[PDB]
Design a protein around this ligand. Structure first.
Ligand SMILES: [K+]
Ligand SMILES: [K+]
Ligand SMILES: [K+]
Ligand SMILES: [Mg+2]
Ligand SMILES: [Mg+2]
Ligand SMILES: [Mg+2]
Ligand SMILES: [Mg+2]
Ligand SMILES: [Mg+2]
Ligand SMILES: [Mg+2]
Lengths: 254, 88, 224, 372, 253, 260
RNA sequence: AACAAAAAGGAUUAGAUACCCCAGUAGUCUUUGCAGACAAUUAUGAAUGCCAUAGGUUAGAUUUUUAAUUUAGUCUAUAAA
């Protein structure tokens, strides 16, 4: 069917993406009737409280609070599992990873691939990468688990900063020359999926809808896209409260 | 033994005489009268009864005809569905 | 070719060309039909192309020049063999009326044949035995005969309680002043009476035809 | 592995319709009528039903809605579909009440189906765990092969001279090599029974020439070989040297799925008269009087032989609605041809009065106006 | 879970695989009475008939709904046509939701190619973007060619090919329910499905009725904002030109 | 399918103040109404009664002898819920209109108390005691007490199962015994032949049940014990019940036409 | 034996070689040669590769031999053409 779609030369890229978006939504046989949103509600709320810091030490500290008995979050089973994972991940990778997630939010897409080319170059020289790959993939788990440069995160003192070394360009590594000079700070066309907090927020801060009326605003705007009612309903369960009673609903922040 | 064939496309599927064209009920009585005259004679007395039956025929009224049979209407509904088609 | 030339798949191409220019050369074209821009980006789908249909059963490998390649194939499931076995051992199970009318098509969402024959939404029927048998014959590794006997015996004990409850339910109702209407045994006989009479009238009126036509066969009209 | 559309159709209701089973077998060499056909012994198609709100619309879950004139008005909505769409673009259907209501009328008799007996009446249910079994082990011996009711091999006495030749040519002839192996497995039991009976004071099981001689030894005793041949081909027992091998095994379950009661050993507690001696009588219709000198009666839609004992001797056009007789259904069984045969017996006098009293037909009611 | 009057009282906006299967939309005709051209929509064979693929019916139905919604969004005249006996309540309800025309009796041959004879004395009216009747078109409505539908939704193409052939000549797009024996070349947008079931015809028709209703709502909402989603037709467009000419003639005089 | 619906004022959670413990009402309604509905579902799972309502199944399976077992579960579910639906968390003051008809028909509200309570114990069997409203086309509204047996229904459309008089201790050779026996066969014969004994109005507007008292053992055996020694038992159960009646709602459903 | 060009007779008819009738020889049949012309036709040379269906029918084959599937023939009615 995509092969049959013959656009006009004078159609903008927006019109072309709209024709393909409407064509993909015709072959949808519905989402599972019983499978529920995995990262939603309690777990989704916990992620926003535990992964909002700028230090992996504080993140793990917050997870221990959730896993503790009596935590009002109710995600004890989830928090305990994530902790058992982070301990196995490379401690250096966690610092470098958490650092780029905070910096990449202000980078351009073209500037991103250039910085990562420098970062990746530093990992080839590092010890964890060569050890993790040789121990897990080449050995297929044999010879026991991996052995990172620091045995754990406790070896890295608070004042230590093992990230800046990776975010510093190396003059011996030429800058990555891209195939074109295009770039942008945010995806120009990334609103063809389900509505997220950004979409629901804009609709609330713009209009004055209600609990049920707001859900129908998206179910109609997306022309019956499977999962909109479940997604919009979840977003309101977390980031929306009856600030005006049953009349309308606003965000919980303020 | 084979089964009935599937009729080819016809211009119209119908029966010629829908209602049975029954015969005059007395033409049989006259034959009986004519049968006695051949065996018992004309001016005989044995045929005196059959003659009375023959005279009773024409003195009685003619039964009214039956309503038309709607067979041909239903044959025309199922023609294309029962045969190989309909000729134009 | 008695058929006519249908160009329904090219209404847009034909309509858009007729609207491109004006018949009065030297003037701008008039406004096109209102539907032209509506289906501008919704072209028709390909038709009349014969694809290789879904093969519900393996095609004959020994065939060297196979025919009927573009012919849809028969849908067959492992349960077809089981349904035929059960309903042939229990022909009168077909007399129990079954409603094949669908309600919402969501029957298979509450069917967990690991529990037993009694499921949600569907009645206890020969289908339950086939589904229960198939589950045992696949999960518990039982054989066709072993799984058949198990699901088959569970099915009998349930039917027995259904028949024992009708009799007892009516017997106790009368012990406390409960009366009922006519039953099929009585209603069924009355219908036979009314139909038997119709036959008696036909036979009585049809026998008079033979005896009269028979006696009149001889030409005894002379009255000697 | 299957698309979501194909997954729904599989569990669909219309896809769960059972295939049309072959009709009840009749005399193969006997003549019949092909134009007209009456009710069959047992049903072959599934009876369908709808909701009262849907029947008024003609919707029966089929391809098209059915005509209202021939499907509305009656009490029990029942329909039999022969073809969901025929060459006339119509759903060839018929009423299913001839069998749908025959099942309800039979179950109203409240009688089980017992195993056929020979002529000490001992009515044994057909659902017993020792007799009602179909899964057997290769070690299954002969003494326990009579309890079964479902055999893979045919009944040699029931086949025609033509069907028997086709069987000998296409079923038993290409099984010679397999049968020789079946003997070797027995030899494994013959050489171990005598070699392991003294240890408490397996054999090679693969031979070529020893088998040829063992079979010759059995030529003096043909009975021990037939039991060995029948056990391999899974043939139903024929003669005693027990499980009613007269007419052959049943082509269906001994109950045929018409009744699932396992006994009639119970008493009916009457509201005023306490428990009863026998089950309530049932009125029957007389068909084909003696004057064949045997009479036929219609009980609950089934035809049976009249009681061993008038109205059943000579036809009487004066009787309205035909001659009718009150009787009691003693025993019900399913023969080898799939038919349901009832051993009817004449009903008592007082019982017919008790039954007529409830329905309001008794002339002199046994209660109130019965001084003696 | 099911009420026979549900497809009319509250038709669904979109049809799922379960709704289509429950409505008997997958039951084709006998395998012998099949148009081998439309073997592309057949899933298999069972019970002696052809089974239409549920995925194929759903995809084609969601596509037709888009066509109905856009034609109604651009101010087009739609015509729902179901002529079989028990299809009058279905077609009338669908046309009501979409603010369209209905036809439940035998189509008169020539009502499109010969509309001057058959639709000569039927009254019309001129309306603006808000469907408000405009005054001052009395001279136009008297000397005007009758209207033809901008879209035709046929619920039984097999039974009326005269209607569909006139749409092919008049260059009018059409939507049809194509059963296993129907020729798919008769319509522009096919909906492979059982056309003999009043339960499947009510679902398909109700879904297309919601599409038209959803399209009319957007057209009238854009009008309140002062945005017209259509342009004056060529018929009325010419009237404005010669109308100003008569005013231009009197301009000097 | 038929599913269990919540109670009036969260009786399942707290229960009545001094009539039934939260654990008793749980075993009486939740653990029983659910048990009846599970069996009711299996009987109508593939029939026309699959989506019909309880009262609709009652009137439709009243006379048919091949559906008496379906009637029991449908009638029991309807009668059981009818009992809890008329209970109040706090005693209610009897309205003036209802307080008048009760005195005019039964003489005094206290007389009606002993009549219903007396009938519950005098019946010696699980059943329901109803407060019926009878109004013939020509006669005025009149209240009476009807006592049904195990699962009998009071509605006139289901008179076939108006099980209100046992046959083991009411039909005998005594003078009054023979009279009951005659009425027994007169009903069975009239119902069988289709004739109607008591002409009724269309729509079953003759009898309109207003109040009910469930005397089954599962509702009081646990709370009020067996009753040995005069303490508790089925007697006290009927007494405490009389205090929690929703006379406000009872008067409503009665629809006593104003004529004062 | 029978049938039957020819020859001949009797009728019919305006006339009647004729059509009809009473009879009747070659010839048809057997064996051995000659002869080679036919609406010797499917008004269609033989052969090969290929193109979508439906309903019958003929001789098999396979199968859960009910009835389906399939190989090779033949006919009917259609699609694309
Ligand atoms: K001659
Ligand atoms: K001559
Ligand atoms: K052929
Ligand atoms: Mg059709
Ligand atoms: Mg010759
Ligand atoms: Mg030669
Ligand atoms: Mg020739
Ligand atoms: Mg040649
Ligand atoms: Mg030939």
């Amino acid at each position: 069917r995509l092969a049959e779609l013959t656009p006009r030369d004078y159609w903008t890229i927006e019109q072309r993406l709209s024709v393909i978006n409407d064509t993909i939504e015709e072959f949808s046989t519905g989402v599972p009737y019983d499978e529920n949103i995995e990262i939603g509600g309690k777990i989704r709320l916990a992620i926003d409280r535990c992964f909002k810091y700028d230090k992996i030490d504080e993140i793990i500290a917050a997870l221990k609070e959730e896993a503790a008995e009596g935590a009002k979050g109710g995600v004890q089973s989830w928090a305990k599992n994530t902790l058992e994972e982070l301990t196995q991940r490379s401690p250096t990778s966690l610092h470098v990873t958490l650092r780029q997630m905070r910096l990449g939010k202000s980078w351009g897409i073209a500037h991103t691939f250039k910085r990562e080319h420098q970062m990746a170059a530093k990992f080839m020289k590092s010890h964890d990468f060569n050890e993790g790959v040789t121990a897990l993939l080449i050995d297929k788990g044999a010879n026991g688990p991996a052995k990172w440069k620091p045995a754990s995160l406790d070896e890295i003192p608070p004042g230590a900063n093992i990230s800046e070394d990776y975010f510093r360009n190396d003059p011996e590594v030429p800058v990555l020359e891209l195939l074109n000079d295009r770039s942008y700070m945010q995806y120009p066309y990334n609103k063809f999926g389900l509505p997220n907090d950004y979409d629901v927020k804009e609709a609330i801060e713009k209009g004055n809808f209600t609990r049920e009326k707001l859900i129908d605003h998206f179910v109609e705007t997306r022309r019956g896209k499977q999962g909109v009612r479940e997604a919009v309903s979840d977003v309101l369960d977390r980031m929306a409260v009856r600030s005006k009673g049953t009349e309308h609903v606003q965000w919980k922040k303020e | 033994p084979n089964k009935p064939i599937r009729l080819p496309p016809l211009k119209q599927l119908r029966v010629r005489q829908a209602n049975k064209a029954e015969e005059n009920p007395c033409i049989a009585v006259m034959s009986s009268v004519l049968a006695c005259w051949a065996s018992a004679g004309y001016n005989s007395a044995g045929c005196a009864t059959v003659e009375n039956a023959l005279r009773a025929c024409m003195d009685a009224p003619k039964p009214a005809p039956k309503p038309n049979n709607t067979i041909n209407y239903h044959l025309s509904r199922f023609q294309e569905r029962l045969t190989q088609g309909k000729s134009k | 070719g008695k058929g006519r030339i249908f160009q329904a798949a090219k209404v847009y191409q034909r309509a858009s060309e007729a609207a491109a220019t004006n018949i009065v050369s030297g003037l701008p074209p008039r406004n096109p039909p209102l539907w032209l821009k509506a289906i501008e980006s919704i072209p028709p789908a390909e038709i009349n192309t014969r694809p290789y249909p879904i093969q519900h059963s393996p095609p004959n490998p020994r065939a060297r020049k196979p025919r009927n390649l573009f012919r849809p194939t028969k849908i067959v499931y492992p349960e077809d063999e089981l349904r035929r076995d059960f309903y042939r051992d229990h022909p009168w199970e077909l007399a129990r009326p079954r409603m094949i009318i669908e309600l919402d098509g969501k029957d298979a969402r509450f069917l967990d044949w690991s529990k037993g024959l009694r499921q949600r939404g569907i009645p206890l029927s020969g289908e339950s035995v086939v589904q229960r048998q198939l589950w045992l014959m696949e999960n518990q590794g039982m054989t066709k005969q072993e799984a058949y006997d198990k699901a088959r015996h569970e099915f009998y004990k349930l039917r027995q309680l259904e028949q024992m409850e009708r009799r007892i339910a009516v017997e106790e109702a009368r012990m406390v002043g409960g009366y009922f209407g006519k039953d099929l045994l009585t209603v069924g006989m009355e219908l036979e009476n009314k139909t038997y009479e119709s036959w008696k009238k036909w036979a009585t009126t049809e026998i008079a035809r033979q005896e009269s036509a028979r006696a009149s066969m001889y030409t005894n009209v002379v009255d000697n | 592995g299957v698309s979501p559309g194909g997954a729904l159709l599989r569990t669909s209701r219309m896809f769960s319709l059972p295939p049309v089973i072959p009709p009840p077998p009749g005399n193969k060499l006997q003549m019949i009528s092909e134009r007209a056909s009456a009710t069959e012994a047992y049903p072959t198609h599934q009876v369908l039903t709808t909701f009262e709100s849907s029947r008024s619309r003609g919707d029966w879950g089929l391809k098209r809605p059915l005509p209202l004139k021939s499907t509305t008005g009656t009490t029990y909505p029942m329909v039999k579909v022969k073809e969901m769409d025929s060459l006339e673009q119509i759903t060839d259907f018929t009423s299913g009440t001839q069998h749908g209501l025959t099942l309800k009328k039979f179950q109203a008799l409240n009688i089980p189906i017992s195993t056929p007996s020979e002529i000490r009446p001992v009515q044994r249910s057909v659902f017993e765990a020792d007799t009602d079994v179909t899964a057997f082990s290769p070690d299954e011996q002969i003494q326990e092969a009579e309890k079964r009711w479902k055999f893979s091999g045919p009944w040699l006495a029931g086949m025609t001279p033509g069907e028997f030749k086709e069987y000998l040519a296409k079923t038993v002839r290409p099984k010679r090599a397999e049968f020789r192996k079946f003997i070797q497995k027995k030899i494994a039991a013959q050489k171990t029974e005598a070699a392991n009976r003294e240890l408490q004071e397996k054999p090679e099981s693969i031979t070529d020439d020893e088998v040829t001689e063992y079979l010759r030894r059995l030529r003096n005793d043909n009975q021990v070989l037939y039991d060995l041949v029948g056990q391999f081909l899974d043939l139903a027992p024929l003669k005693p040297p027990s499980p009613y091998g007269g007419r052959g095994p049943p082509i269906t379950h001994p109950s045929a799925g018409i009744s699932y009661l396992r006994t009639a050993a119970y008493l009916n507690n009457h509201p005023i008269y306490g428990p009863q001696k026998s089950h309530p009588p049932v009125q029957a219709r007389v068909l084909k009087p003696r004057r064949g000198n045997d009479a036929k009666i219609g009980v609950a839609g089934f035809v049976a032989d009249g009681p061993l004992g008038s109205v059943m001797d000579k036809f009487d056009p004066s009787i309205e609605g035909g001659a009718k007789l009150w009787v009691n259904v003693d025993k019900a069984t399913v023969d080898s041809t799939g038919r349901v045969q009832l051993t009817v017996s004449d009903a008592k006098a007082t019982d017919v009065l008790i039954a007529k009293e409830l329905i309001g037909d008794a002339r002199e009611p046994i209660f109130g106006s019965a001084p003696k | 879970r099911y009420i026979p009057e549900q497809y009319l009282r509250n038709p669904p906006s979109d049809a799922s695989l379960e709704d289509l299967m429950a409505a008997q939309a997958h039951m084709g005709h006998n395998t012998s009475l099949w148009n081998p051209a439309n073997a592309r929509y057949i899933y298999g064979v069972r019970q002696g008939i052809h089974i239409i693929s549920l995925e194929t019916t759903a995809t084609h139905l969601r596509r037709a709904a888009r066509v109905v919604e856009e034609v109604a969004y651009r101010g087009g005249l739609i015509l729902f046509v179901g002529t079989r006996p028990g299809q009058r309540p279905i077609v009338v309800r669908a046309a009501e939701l979409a603010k369209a025309c209905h036809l439940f009796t035998k189509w008169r041959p020539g009502t499109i190619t010969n509309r001057e004879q058959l639709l000569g004395g039927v009254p019309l009216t001129v309306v603006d973007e808000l469907d408000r009747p405009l005054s001052g078109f009395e001279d136009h409505l008297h000397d005007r060619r009758p209207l033809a539908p901008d879209l035709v939704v046929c619920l039984n193409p097999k039974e009326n090919m005269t209607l569909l052939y006139e749409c092919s000549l008049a260059k009018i797009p059409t939507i049809g329910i194509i059963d296993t024996n129907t020729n798919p070349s008769w319509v522009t947008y096919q909906i492979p499905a059982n056309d003999d079931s009043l339960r499947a015809t009510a679902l398909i028709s109700g879904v297309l009725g919601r599409a038209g209703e959803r399209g009319q709502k957007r057209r009238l909402e854009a009008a309140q904002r002062g945005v017209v989603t259509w342009k004056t037709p060529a018929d009325v467009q010419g009237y404005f030109e010669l109308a100003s000419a008569r005013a231009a003639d009197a301009r000097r005089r | 399918q038929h599913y269990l619906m919540p109670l009036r004022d969260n009786f399942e959670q707290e229960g009545i103040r001094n009539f039934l413990s939260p654990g008793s009402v749980n075993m009486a309604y939740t653990e029983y109404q659910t048990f009846i509905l599970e069996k009711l579902n299996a009987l109508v799972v593939g029939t026309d009664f699959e989506q019909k309502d309880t009262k609709s199944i009652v009137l439709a399976t009243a006379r048919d002898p091949e559906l008496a077992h379906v009637f029991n579960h449908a009638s029991m579910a309807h009668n059981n819920h009818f009992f809890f639906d008329h209970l109040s968390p706090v005693p209610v003051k009897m309205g003036d209109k209802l307080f008048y008809h009760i005195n005019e028909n039964f003489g005094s509200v206290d007389t009606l108390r002993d009549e219903m309570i007396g009938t519950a114990v005098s019946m010696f069997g699980p059943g329901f005691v109803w407060l019926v409203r009878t109004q013939l086309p020509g006669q005025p509204v009149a209240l009476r007490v009807m006592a049904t047996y195990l699962a009998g229904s009071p509605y006139p459309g289901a008179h076939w199962r108006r099980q209100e008089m046992d046959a083991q201790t009411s039909i005998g050779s005594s003078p009054q015994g023979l009279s009951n026996g005659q009425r027994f066969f007169e009903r069975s014969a009239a119902g069988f032949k289709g004739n109607k004994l008591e002409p009724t109005a269309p729509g079953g507007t003759d009898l309109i049940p207003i109040l009910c008292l469930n005397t089954w053992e599962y509702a009081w055996l646990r709370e009020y014990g067996t009753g040995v020694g005069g303490m508790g038992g089925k007697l006290a159960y009927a007494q405490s019940w009389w205090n929690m009646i929703d006379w406000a709602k009872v008067e409503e459903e009665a629809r006593l036409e104003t004529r004062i």
